[PDB]
Amino acid sequence: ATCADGRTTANAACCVLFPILDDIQENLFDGAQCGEEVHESLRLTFHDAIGFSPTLGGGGADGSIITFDTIETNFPANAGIDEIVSAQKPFVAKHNISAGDFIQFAGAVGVSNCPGGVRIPFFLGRPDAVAASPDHLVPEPFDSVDTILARMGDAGFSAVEVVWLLASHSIAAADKVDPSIPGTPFDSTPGVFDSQFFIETQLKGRLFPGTPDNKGEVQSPLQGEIRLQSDHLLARDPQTACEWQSMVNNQPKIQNRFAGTMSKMALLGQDKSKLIDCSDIIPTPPALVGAAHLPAGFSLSDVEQACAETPFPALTADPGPVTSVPPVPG
Numbered sequence: 001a002t003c004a005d006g007r008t009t010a011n012a013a014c015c016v017l018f019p020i021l022d023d024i025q026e027n028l029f030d031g032a033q034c035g036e037e038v039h040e041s042l043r044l045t046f047h048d049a050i051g052f053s054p055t056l057g058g059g060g061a062d063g064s065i066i067t068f069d070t071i072e073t074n075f076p077a078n079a080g081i082d083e084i085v086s087a088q089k090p091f092v093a094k095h096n097i098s099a100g101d102f103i104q105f106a107g108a109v110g111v112s113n114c115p116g117g118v119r120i121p122f123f124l125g126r127p128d129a130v131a132a133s134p135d136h137l138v139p140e141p142f143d144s145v146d147t148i149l150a151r152m153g154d155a156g157f158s159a160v161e162v163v164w165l166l167a168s169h170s171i172a173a174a175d176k177v178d179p180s181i182p183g184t185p186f187d188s189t190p191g192v193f194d195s196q197f198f199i200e201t202q203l204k205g206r207l208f209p210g211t212p213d214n215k216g217e218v219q220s221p222l223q224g225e226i227r228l229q230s231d232h233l234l235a236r237d238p239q240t241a242c243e244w245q246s247m248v249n250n251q252p253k254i255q256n257r258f259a260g261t262m263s264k265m266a267l268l269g270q271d272k273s274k275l276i277d278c279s280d281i282i283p284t285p286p287a288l289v290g291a292a293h294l295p296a297g298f299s300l301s302d303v304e305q306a307c308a309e310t311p312f313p314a315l316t317a318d319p320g321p322v323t324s325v326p327p328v329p330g
């Protein structure tokens, strides 16, 4: 098909996405950058989609977190999501796609702006949300590993799929875990979709980057990096540790598994055969920058080996003394 301005797409319903793409790239993502709004938009894909259970209910990736914002943004597990919901709302109102479609589209577009990123398949045609998600369907960083894995399992994901989705934490920061240090990333490269998250979570902890005693947090290996309790434990648990380690220095696996599992997440509560493929709209991401490494000052002895089948790979360390990670600009 050929759209209004001459750009082409396989299925013509998808032409509606071109003006939306242009608009969000300029006016939501600050000129196609991999920064705070991209990261928050990716977080939103999960907080919308995971509100799905075959028995507890919820419509999954249905836009409910926007349409029923006054209910959902008040769930404890959704703390801080109100900012990005408020930012996306006027875009949904202005454009001609459902809220569910918009959230997944914006996430996919955003990930495609990040160096090292991947093109996530994107489907059009989710109907409007019917009801708010039930509460207590979004995992929390202080939930037991088995609780997180069961919740994700209930939604349809294997333990290895949870690991692949958590590649998202390679382009990610926290504002509410430790409110004294908002914008503190989960890896040293929050502007690059890379394996540093999987590496740096495997290191022995050293310090709290801000205050002690925050729920859902444990010690981090680096000033200016924060470590979730859940991420600490998933890197070490027998169900997930070998898969976690397998991501290290394997950019093509990170990309391919993230794209496939994000597609599956984007379709929770939906039927792919009742939607239209608009994957060819997503831009081509920039190339990976940087290579897999231990942080400056670290060595292999600082890695906590938790995969029983295979030792952690030796990686070279950046040169020089231990440095600290800059926060993500708000």
Ligand code: HEM
Pocket: 036, 039, 040, 042, 043, 044, 045, 046, 080, 139, 140, 141, 142, 148, 162, 165, 166, 168, 169, 171, 172, 173, 174, 175, 176, 177, 178, 216, 228, 230
């Ligand atoms: C498996 C269980 C998960 C837990 C317990 C978890 C927990 C968290 C927490 C506590 C934060 C910080 C929020 C704040 O204080 O500002 C966060 C951020 C984030 N999460 Fe996860 N998460 C999980 C899975 C995922 C998944 C599957 C995705 C996929 C999209 C995702 C994407 C993100 C992103 C991109 C951010 C960064 C937001 C920003 O930088 O503005 N998370 N996550």
Ligand SMILES: [Ca+2]
Pocket: 047, 048, 049, 050, 051, 059, 060, 061, 062, 063, 064, 065, 133
């Ligand atoms: Ca939802």
Ligand SMILES: [Ca+2]
Pocket: 169, 170, 171, 187, 188, 189, 190, 191, 192, 193, 194, 195, 196, 197
């Ligand atoms: Ca990264």
